[PDB]
Amino acid sequence: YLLNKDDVLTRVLEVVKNFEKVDASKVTPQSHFVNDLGLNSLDVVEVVFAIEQEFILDIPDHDAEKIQSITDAVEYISQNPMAK
Amino acid sequence: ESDFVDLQLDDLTNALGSASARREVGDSSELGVVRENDIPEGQVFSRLNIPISSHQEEQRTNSRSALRVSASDTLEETIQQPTSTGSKQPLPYDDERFADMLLEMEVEGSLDETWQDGRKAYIEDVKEILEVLRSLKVRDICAIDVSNKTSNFDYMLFGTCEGPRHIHLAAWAVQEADALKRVCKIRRKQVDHTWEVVPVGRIIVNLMQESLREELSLERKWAVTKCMDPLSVANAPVSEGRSVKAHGLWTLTLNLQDLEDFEVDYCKDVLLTQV
Amino acid sequence: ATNHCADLYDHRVIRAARGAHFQKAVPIYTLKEEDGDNVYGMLNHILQRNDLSPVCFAARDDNDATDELDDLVRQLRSAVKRETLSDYCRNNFTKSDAKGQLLMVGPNHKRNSVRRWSKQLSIPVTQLLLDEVSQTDALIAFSVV
Amino acid sequence: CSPFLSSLLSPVETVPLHDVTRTYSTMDVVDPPARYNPMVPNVEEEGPVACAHKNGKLWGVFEGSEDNKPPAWFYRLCKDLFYRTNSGVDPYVWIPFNLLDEADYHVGPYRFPSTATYTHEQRTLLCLGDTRREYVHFCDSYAFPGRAQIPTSVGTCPSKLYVNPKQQQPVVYIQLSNDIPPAMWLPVKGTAASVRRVLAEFASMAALHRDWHHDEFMERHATAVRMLELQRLPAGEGDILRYMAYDARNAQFAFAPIREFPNQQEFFLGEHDDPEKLMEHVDLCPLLFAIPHMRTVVDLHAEHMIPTIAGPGVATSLYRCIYSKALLFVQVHLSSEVKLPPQDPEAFKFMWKDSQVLPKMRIPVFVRVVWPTNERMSGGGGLLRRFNRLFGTEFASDIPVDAAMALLYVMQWSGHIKDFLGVRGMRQRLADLLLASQQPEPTKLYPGTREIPNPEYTVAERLGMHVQYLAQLHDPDISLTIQRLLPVASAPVRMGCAKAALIAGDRELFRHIVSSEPPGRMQTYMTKLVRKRKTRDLVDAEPRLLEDQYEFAAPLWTK
Amino acid sequence: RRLLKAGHQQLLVTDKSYYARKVRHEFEVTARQTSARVRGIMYERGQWLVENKLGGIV
Ligand SMILES: *P(=O)(O)OCC(C)(C)[C@@H](O)C(=O)NCCC(=O)NCCSC(=O)CCCCCCCCC
């Protein structure tokens, strides 16, 4: 039903580490996409859509514009019942 | 069950003359036989001899026809629409009479009865050309359907090749994939080392390099271009003419020299609808 | 020259020969199977015409390897005399009238050339060896032979 | 320990040629000219069961019968066939039954036609080990049109029905024509419904053939009449039939019903210096219509049919079977040669200008049997399996007995029963050629040279040609055999392997062979064999640097 | 986001990577080069593409 936050964090960390713009050592479990990682908002859309690629769940437009940090991405998938 | 007598009963009389043991011979007698699987009559093949399983619409998608509309009407909806139309208001197009007449013709559907064309291309040929170009390792394959839009071709494929050798190789491979129904071959001598055009029926194939592809930007053009609307001819005519005040009484004056290619692609219909 | 020898008109061949191509005494031929010449047919014709004896010198001895043709035949269905050079010359040159010699020299890169010669040559070919010079250099070996 | 291997190693040694060093007496010399002699002709005791039938004890000889009356099953079968009990009409679909009387029966053994040329052992096998065994012809069921008539016509000669007087189970043998021996008589159960279905299969096939080709045959008839009128020839029935059988030559290839039926199989009929003789044998076959769908006269001396290494192609003919309406597609391949032309033609012409002896020619002929899916027309799988185990042939389990016996009779009348074989026989011949190439080869008339080659065939050329034949016969493992044979192949053998891969349709394997072939005339001709874009696409294994670029032909020659 | 998701939902033969690159290039350079009115025109046209299936990009 509800996946544990530890396994949800391992997946989202692997995505942002293997991303084309985010560096490996520059990422930290408590980081922001724009400030701590230095990404643009158009790149925030790509890393969010990348998370939606591995998590089969579909995020609406309003709930997607709220995820601006890795902490928000983990908490959303945790409360989402469609976390495969 | 078989209408013939026992095969063993015949072999019993045959073995007195054969004096041999035959075993596992059916496989060696069958390994040379060829069986042709039948084809259904309803299944038709495309221009590249490929079976077709996806249907299409003979009309245009942008149309507004009562025959195309499948939603069942309602008395309350009709009464609300009548109460709304009780207030007369002209259309945003220039010619009010022509716009009303064209909308009536569209909702009547005679425009589709006049523009019905069953010579459409197939997506199977586009997919086959895509697979051929992928085998040739052609980067950034982009296919666009412009059948609804004002053009001469149904599908436009765009591919990026690195070098005249690769361009000519991809062109020859597309030609050999179209070898079944083609009537001519491509030019032997390349008159343009950065651009190649291969016609395959109503499908066109452009093979370009990175620089020329980014310069032309035909894919963005044909994507941004909206589909054909019969109400577009209700706008004012345009003609480049300098008047005493740069204003036409029945025509329009728009200069596209000060606008870039992308600006033109994005504002072509916008300017016609505005002025 | 047979079996994909270096081109007779190669620059290194010319430099090593030093005019051996412009002479008229010793004729040099190239039997290329890819042009239409049956090398072993020509060689057997020469043997049966001039009544020669075939000897062969391989720079390397053949290795005990099976032939793929035997397995291919089974799938579709379902002895060379070694004689040292010195004693060979003794036994074949002391008599009054000796037959001419057809000498086939080659380096065995695949170590089957002796077997293939014996297969494709009539009048079973003799194998010339060197007792104390068994494993030697191709140049000095061919010079001595 | 093989006949073909013996023919390869030790030849026949027919004509001797004396020289100053040896005597070349083993040469495949062309046969002397044929001469027609009017003096030479063309054609070249009652058994116990028959005596008992004459005396009136036929029903007593009948095993399952009463000593006085016919058998119960036989009487019921006759009643059913006579009254149509158990199961303005179309004569093609209708199945008549003409039951004969006891005084009208035909009791006796099968008598081969006066023109049937079979050996004693072959006649024994066609009579199923007992030539003296006698049958009782009692009825005729369905008729088939005459051979010389239009293929879409009504039947005139009825098929016969026999019953073995002494057997344990009720069996009715159906014979389509006098040219079919008891080894191919369809054995059906004593059921009238079974007989009716067996005959209705042929009836439906004849009706389909008519509905499909009668309009075409009548258009050809009108064309023949018009052409007789134009050429001022006599206009009669036989004349029109002859002219239709002739215009079968002028019939086009695109409009030929080659793939009319689903199933097809390939057979190799041997190599012929003059395949026109075999073609005439096929034309004069009693089990085939005299008016074929398509005919091609193979004339090797025509400028368009001269056999070359990259030869003109295939001469194609198409014949129709009378009783099963199957198709025989005869293909004379004029492109199987793996011998390069002479470098200087003047010297070769000076050498072979006054020679009074020419070598034989090895030109392959194949036949494609094309037949529809049938359940009771091929006589079941057991009949064809018996035929295969008896004659060492490789026939399918559903190929019509009509076409099977047609091919058998043609091959036996031509005298190439050993050359008639299939995939297994071709594999055996390939193994024999491999053994012959391993063995030392005999000296020919003179050694081959790029300037003046030897027209006689060598073992390597025979091996290449037979690799081509094995590819043509649709071998399932032809690509694997070519891959295993290529490393130990000579230049003609590699040319044959390239042609064989091209015939099988493996463009990748063909490009691999062409790229592995060392540069030379062989590589040039194997490049000229195909329709290509550029010769470097096939020749260059690795991409050759051209204007700081590299081309790739793997996508062009893959699959 | 709507454009990217619609492309990855219905983009069969066209390279999704190339499509994303083209959309990024547009959003990042074309609007920043052109004027604000043309930026709004491009915004409306992108909405039209989202509602009309990328404008025939098959
Ligand atoms: P984030 O805040 O880091 O960045 C947001 C963006 C919009 C990227 C700004 O930083 C920015 O770059 N602004 C430039 C000016 C502007 O507002 N541009 C808006 C984009 S216009 C638009 O929507 C273009 C859509 C056109 C459709 C393209 C389809 C092409 C198919 C080939």
Would you state the torsion angle of the CA atoms of residues D85, D86, D87, D88, taken in this order, to the nearest 10 degrees? Answer: 0
Structure determined by: cryo-EM
Which residues on adjacent β-strands are paired with residue B142? Answer: B158
What letter does residue A24 receive in the DSSP assignment?
T
What's the CA gap between C127 and C129, in Å, rounded? 6
Which residues on A lie below 8 Å from E4 (Cβ)? 45-46, 49
Minimum CA–CA partner of D20 in chain C:
C49
What's the gap in Å between A44 CA and the centre of ligand 1?
A: 14
SS3 content of chain D, % helix, strand, coil (to 5): 40, 15, 50
Across the interface, which of E12, E19, E42 has its CB nearest the CB of B266? Answer: E42
Both structure tokens of D342? 């002479």
Cβ contact B147:B225 at 8 Å: no
Mutate to test the interface with C, among D23, D490, D494, D539 (most CBs of C within 10 A): D490
Q: Judge whether E18 is closer than 8 Å to chain B, CB to CB.
A: yes
Dihedral sign for Cα atoms in the order D478, D484, D486, D489:
negative
Q: Measure Cα distances from D311 to A78, C119, D303, D363, D520 in Å.
A: 74, 33, 11, 11, 19
Pairwise CB contact (< 8 Å): B32 & D266:
yes
Both structure tokens of B274? 């505005």
What letter does residue D110 receive in the DSSP assignment?
-
List of residues 6+ apart from D265 with CB closer than 8 A: B32, B33, B34, D368, D369, D395, D396, D399
For residue D524, give the 3-state DSSP assignment: helix
What's the CA gap between E40 and E34, in Å, rounded? 10
What's the gap in Å between E23 CA and the centre of ligand 1?
A: 9
- Three-state SS string over C78-107 comes to CCCEEEEHHHHHHHHHCCCCCCEEEEEEEC
What's the CA gap between D388 and B275, in Å, rounded? 88
What's the CA gap between A19 and D168, in Å, rounded? 84
Find the radius of gyration of the CA atoms of chain A.
Answer: 12
C40: nearest Cα among D24, D495, D491, D20: D491
What's the CA gap between D380 and D307, in Å, rounded? 42
Strand C52-58 and strand C100-106: pairing? Answer: parallel
C36: nearest Cα among D352, D349, D448, D513: D448
Residues with CB under 6 A from ligand 1: A 40-42; B 220, 223; E 22-23, 26-28, 31-32, 39, 42-43, 45-46, 49
- Other Cβ atoms within 10 Å of D209 Cβ, number: 18
What's the gap in Å between A41 CA and the centre of ligand 1?
A: 10
For residue D163, give the 3-state DSSP assignment: strand
Cβ contact D394:B28 at 8 Å: yes
For residue C138, give the 3-state DSSP assignment: helix
Which residues on A lie below 8 Å from E24 (Cβ)? 42
Minimum CA–CA partner of B34 in chain D:
D264
Alpha carbons within 13 angstroms on the beta-carbon side of residue C144 total 18
List E residues 19-58 in contact with B (Cβ-Cβ < 8 A): 19, 22, 26, 30, 33-34, 38, 41-42, 45, 48-49, 52, 54-58
For D209-225, give the DSSP string: HHHHHHHHHHHHHHHHH
- CA D395 to centroid of chain Cα atoms: 12
List of residues 6+ apart from B39 with CB closer than 8 A: B51
For D287-323, give the DSSP string: TB-SS-SB-----TTSTTS---TT---EEEEEEEBTT
Chains C vs D: touching, with 3+ CB pairs under 8 Å?
yes
CB pairs under 8 A between C and D: 93
Q: Judge whether A68 is closer than 8 Å to chain E, CB to CB.
A: no
Task: Quote the minimal CA–CA distance from D321 to chain C in Å.
Answer: 34
Strand D263-271 and strand D186-189: pairing? Answer: unpaired
Pairwise CB contact (< 8 Å): B17 & D129:
yes
E12 φ/ψ angles, rounded to the nearest 5 degrees: -85, -60
